[PDB]
Structure formats: structure tokens, C-alpha cells
Subunit: 78 residues, 2 copies
């Protein structure tokens, strides 16, 4: 589904940050924080791969990795 | 915390829609769908109460109601 290297890179760098964002109990602030983490990661990869031939596939993978990370932490806390 | 009438109005109108959005298994589409429901509700209330004296309080209540609805359904499915 997703590129395993892309998954390792994003999980490695950003999972702890996304976890902290999800762990904020005040739900508005948590939503804002989670979105901020996602937006940063998306922008980092967009900048890095803007002209790459597999750009569209990469960006779909980044979006899926981020959503799976969020889902895993929401599940894990519940 | 939130105005009980505002809560009843938004839950009554939009909970089933937010539930369907959260229930979509494909996580990107679910995220897009949930955000679309939230954006509509926020815009409806912003338009209705743009000049009201309690606008800021109302809009914070709308944001909290929407986040609580999302949390309740994510919890309920898990
Ligand atoms: Ca999500
Ligand atoms: Ca939320």
C-alpha cells in the first residue's frame, strides 16, 4: 500500500509529536495541534518531491501514513 | 459549558451526517468528509450570528459541540 521507507521516515520523525497532539484532552486544541503536525509533514514532503515523477503517489502515501498514525494513537488511547 | 439549545440544534440536524463521515473506513476520505460536515456547520452559524453580541462565545460552543460529536462517534465505533 504505502512505501515502507516513507512510512519508516515519517513514523520515526513525527510519531511522538502526533501522539502528543492527539493526547491533548481539550478537543479543539487537540484538533488544531494534530492538524498542525499533519500540515508540516505534508509541506516537508511536497517541498522535497514537488518535481519528482512519483509525486502524486508519494503525496497519497504521506496522507495515508499520517491518517494511520492518527488512527493508531486515537485507538491506543481509547 | 456549551449552550444546551445550540447543542440540541446541531446534534439534531447534523449528528447522523457526522456519524456517516466518521464511519467511512478509508481514512483519507473519512477525514475529508468529517471536515466538510464541520465546515458547513461552522459556516451556517457564522452566517447566522456574524453580528450577534455573543458571536465569539457561540462560535466556540459550535467548535466544541462539533469536536465532542466527532469524539463520541469515534469512541462509539471503537
Ligand atoms: Ca483521521
Ligand atoms: Ca476532533
Amino acid at each position: 500500500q504505502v512505501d515502507a521507507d516513507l512510512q519508516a521516515e515519517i513514523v520515526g520523525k513525527y510519531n511522538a509529536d502526533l501522539q502528543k497532539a492527539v493526547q491533548i484532552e481539550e478537543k479543539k486544541a487537540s484538533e488544531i495541534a494534530t492538524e498542525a503536525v499533519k500540515e508540516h509533514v505534508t509541506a516537508e514532503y511536497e517541498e522535497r518531491y514537488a518535481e519528482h515523477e512519483e509525486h502524486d503517489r508519494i503525496m497519497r502515501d504521506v496522507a495515508e501514513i499520517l491518517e494511520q498514525m492518527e488512527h493508531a494513537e486515537v485507538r491506543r488511547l481509547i
